[PDB]
Design an enzyme around this catalytic site. Structure first.
Site, short mmCIF file in Angstrom:
data_model
loop_
_atom_site.label_atom_id
_atom_site.label_comp_id
_atom_site.label_asym_id
_atom_site.label_seq_id
_atom_site.Cartn_x
_atom_site.Cartn_y
_atom_site.Cartn_z
CB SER A 73 0.03 3.77 -9.76
OG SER A 73 -0.19 3.40 -8.40
CG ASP A 110 0.34 0.76 0.39
OD1 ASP A 110 1.00 1.15 -0.61
OD2 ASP A 110 -0.11 1.54 1.26
#
Ligand code: A1LZN
Ligand code: A1LZN
Ligand code: A1LZN
Ligand code: A1LZN
Ligand code: A1LZN
Ligand code: A1LZN
Ligand code: A1LZN
Lengths: 178, 179, 178, 179, 178, 178, 178
Positions: free
Chosen positions: F90, F158
């Protein structure tokens, strides 16, 4: 968290004390009163004629702790300039109002409250809480030059005053911007 | 929460007060408070057994045995001790207040003084033991106020505070000063 | 919290250790025992004949921790003056009674207790707690010069002694006021 | 919990004890205790591999793998190690006590010694692994006491403490002293 | 808590780092990885040919944190001696196995585990944990010189090895006593 | 905890900052961003031409805090080498990708993720989280040279990529072992 | 000549030994040293923590005999109170100064001398007497805490000290009247 400044180095709060500034910020309890009283007695010993600056941003606190500060203020000989920054509520506005006449100040956007909250070191009886409340009445009456009846009705209103209202009421003398 | 530094030599403000022969008794009294107070009393006496010591008290009370330890150390050392009531002195706090040197017990104008005991204990104790302690408080208070036991017992039964002037007339202190 | 005193600067507790004073204040556990033993061994190395002053204000604590201090007291060569300040209960009163004969003291308003509470580092068996209780019987019998039966009856009564009863019982030698 | 300073040079009292070549094993044994103890052992050996080290033990026990790390470091270094039981040595504490240099294992008179293991672990482990560790304790205990495996296993089954004289006769230590 | 030693004064751990010793004790997380990586790069800057000693007593920890240390070990130029004291389980035994060939050691009573526990910085998907498990397979195969199949079977067994078992398996080189 | 190295003495992290290394280890929040920004501005003040080394092992964190670092990285003139150690997920992977072109690196066993978790200092509206997500798309597109559609489809998965996948995607330039 | 006191009956000197009192009165020779040592070892065997009281009224004597008593005093574990009554000259004042710190005493009209007379069991050579004198200088230095030069100059003066002079010099701790 706390920075160092300037031959000699100080944390910024110790440097403010070198300027004869005492901060009364945040809620007032016995340890705050202990720290405040320690600085007042110290600053007077350095000079009992040089002014002391008490900068107040406080929501209130323990009543007996506040009266200890109030009493130490009356004890020392120094002129004390009080400044309201942010707010002075309950015991904080009592200290604000107790600075040397002519030397009580506010910044333009402060809020001042003399209403007491609905605290105590230990639990106390109704006769004791009323005795304390009367002490607040007489101290406020003394320093605002208002009468007891004016003080009691004013403290019954749950509200803040603007710096100019507090000036007109006798809590402070001047509202400054620079 | 940050303790300021003051000044050749630099001290924290509380160490600077101890150099002035001032001992603070602020807040509740327990064993570690009593230990800290006793150390300062013995230290200050070792610097001079003739110079007065100033004990500034702002306390709601605390552990009886811990308060009694301070009391005994006060009586032991030779120094005159000026006690000052600032803010309040309740329970063991007014016992230390009343135990200063005669003629040198003071209050600021707005203090509150209480000798009534609260209804605390290091270990859990029996009723005979709490009564033994309560009698020790009676006799110490009678000794320093010069009141009679019966007056002390009736007074400590009233759950209340006195003003500096009542406490002066009761014999807890000698002078109420404003400047 | 802890003040500095003064050529040399000390925290007040370090200055007391310079007087050869060791404080045993508050509950006794292994950490208390480690600190006390560290100081006793140190004070002996500075001089193994100079007296050491042990100031006790304690409600008791771990038995094995207390026995560790007791044994270290017996081991070192120094005479030890004990002082009961405030109180000495359970293992605290055992250390008090274990000072050098003639040098066990109390202040006038102290309370002394040899009754044990109804703790333990790990959980132990009934035979083990009795073994510990008998060791306590023997140490008290040794230093008070009372018999096993007198100690066993006394520790069964849940009560405190005055400094004068503890003196007459053999726990201490003199009750001093100045 | 304030650690005093002792004195040309100033030490906290624990650093002063370490300058005397004393290593404390006081309180429960876990990985950080073992790391701290191992560091002082290697330091003390590097200062002198001939001078004895004094290991003072007052411990209820702790993590077995952590205690074995200390045990192995004791065996690794060349220095004679005098061990002292002060207060108590239970479980891994009694293993280190028994692992001092032969003839140099001592107890104070009123100590308690326990070799029973409690019923701890860094991670959860299987029954074969706990049995493997317990057998390592058997072999280590047999080696330094010079007792047989069967004697060690029966003794470790009894949930009990020994006196210093019992532990002396069992082979856990050599001398029980008072002065 | 942390003792001071010896001209110049050190906390004992800083003194161990001056000896070119790095400790990996306790569980491995990102801050442990940061500390271990900082020391590895520092020790290399002081000498990139001089050996470094890594002392491992660890139950395991975060896989990515363990991989970060592993990669820094491979990156630096220094020979690394690994020592197993107490235990090396999961990521701890991977660091142990990753020392310089011929310099991987254990003390006699250590326990070694390569089985991974049933960890993660954030929650992750099933395909990702399988990617991580394969990285562990490949690293272990590289340094033990065992095959993928044997490494996968061995890590399926929830058990510890003795120092000599780990030696014959290829995790370490020598079991030392003195 | 943190060792001292040495003549002048530094804690090992202060010694790394003297080397112009900035660590971004652990989750990113305002406190980390303040610390990273302070170090970046200081390092530029020492030299606006000398490279800075930013070593990243981070699972992500507060988006605005990460953007504060991103902008400060972009603001200063220095070449910035970024290193992914352990992982960058992230906002950490955004910082890694924002180093100077040609100077973005990974260690061989690192994991990189650009998927955002399902953060914010205060609670925010759906239009606001979408504005931030669009800001992330544009920054990632700018530094990878990939198109918006490629970035948006990729951030929907993901998953982590290997250092070689991240190189081929444009997150970094080189995967090194020494 | 020696009176009896009282059930058990003792000659008064055996009764003083029951109080743990040992007399060192009159000149010191080997037979005195033998008797004194016998009593010290006996009193230690009865209690090695209970203090022993040594009363000194002696003009001095054989150096080796006095050193024998000195060594036995240092050997036993007991605290020893020394009391100077009448006088303590030469080895007598050496024993006086060698009591437990804090427990060395004089009555008000005593005389103390550390000057040695112009003392040997057999005739000896000059170097030997010098060695003995040096041992004496070192013992006095140890227990009075003065320096060697001060002790040697002081011992050159053929004179006695008052109890307060001896107190300020470090030969004794307290001068008592009641
Ligand atoms: O001011 C006083 C004082 C206060 C009070 C009683 C009182 C207490 C209180 F809590 C509030 C009060 F209003 C009044 N009485 N005295 C008389 C003597 C003492 C000490 O001699 N000083 C002087 C002094 C103090 C501190 C320092 C320095 F520097 F250490 F900080 C230096 C000088
Ligand atoms: O006064 C004493 C003393 C009092 C008592 C009994 C007692 C104990 C108690 F807890 C409370 C009490 F009231 C009375 N015992 N001692 C023996 C210890 C010494 C030396 O004789 N001092 C003097 C001294 C102390 C401290 C310092 C300094 F500076 F280090 F702090 C300097 C000098
Ligand atoms: O006194 C001892 C000692 C204690 C014990 C056993 C024991 C341990 C215990 F925990 C409790 C006990 F009752 C007895 N054995 N010894 C013999 C050798 C050692 C070290 O050589 N010293 C000397 C020493 C001098 C100075 C200092 C310092 F560092 F503090 F300055 C520390 C220690
Ligand atoms: O002894 C060793 C050593 C032992 C082992 C194996 C081992 C590890 C273990 F965890 C427990 C063990 F029992 C044995 N590995 N080394 C390599 C590191 C160095 C260099 O040889 N020294 C010497 C040394 C150490 C520390 C210090 C000082 F002062 F910094 F503390 C000074 C000198
Ligand atoms: O070693 C490196 C380095 C590491 C990496 C990448 C990497 C990062 C990582 F987290 C793990 C890795 F495996 C590899 N790239 N470099 C090249 C330039 C830098 C700084 O210039 N140095 C030199 C250096 C470091 C620390 C110190 C001192 F003393 F402060 F500790 C002194 C000098
Ligand atoms: O660089 C700046 C600066 C950048 C920005 C805008 C900005 C803020 C931000 F948060 C992130 C950004 F990307 C950009 N504003 N200033 C204020 C002006 C001062 C000097 O006037 N300097 C120079 C300087 C910095 C730090 C130090 C040191 F290290 F000593 F503290 C010494 C000198
Ligand atoms: O004290 C000692 C002793 C002295 C010395 C050497 C020494 C001799 C000396 F002349 C002066 C010294 F300083 C030291 N070694 N020991 C060790 C063992 C002996 C006996 O076992 N005791 C114990 C003891 C003594 C007397 C009695 C009692 F009452 F019967 F007289 C009872 C027990």
């Amino acid at each position: 968290l706390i920075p160092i400044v300037v031959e000699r180095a100080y944390d910024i709060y110790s440097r403010l004390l070198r300027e004869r500034i005492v901060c009364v910020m945040g809620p007032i309890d016995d340890s705050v009163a202990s720290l405040v009283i320690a600085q007042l007695l110290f600053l007077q010993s350095e000079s009992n004629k040089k002014p002391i600056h008490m900068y107040i941003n406080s929501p209130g606190g323990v009543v007996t702790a506040g009266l200890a500060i109030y009493d130490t203020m009356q004890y020392i000989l120094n002129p004390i300039c009080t400044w309201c920054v942010g707010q002075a509520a309950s015991m904080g506005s009592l200290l604000l109002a107790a600075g040397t006449p002519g030397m009580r100040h506010s910044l333009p956007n402060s809020r001042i409250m003399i209403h007491q909250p609905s605290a105590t070191d230990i639990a106390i009886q109704a006769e004791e809480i009323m005795k304390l409340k009367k002490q607040l009445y007489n101290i406020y009456a003394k320093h605002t030059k208002q009468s007891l009846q004016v003080i009691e009705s004013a403290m019954e209103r749950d509200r803040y005053m603007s710096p100019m209202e507090a000036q007109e009421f006798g809590i402070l003398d001047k509202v400054l911007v620079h």
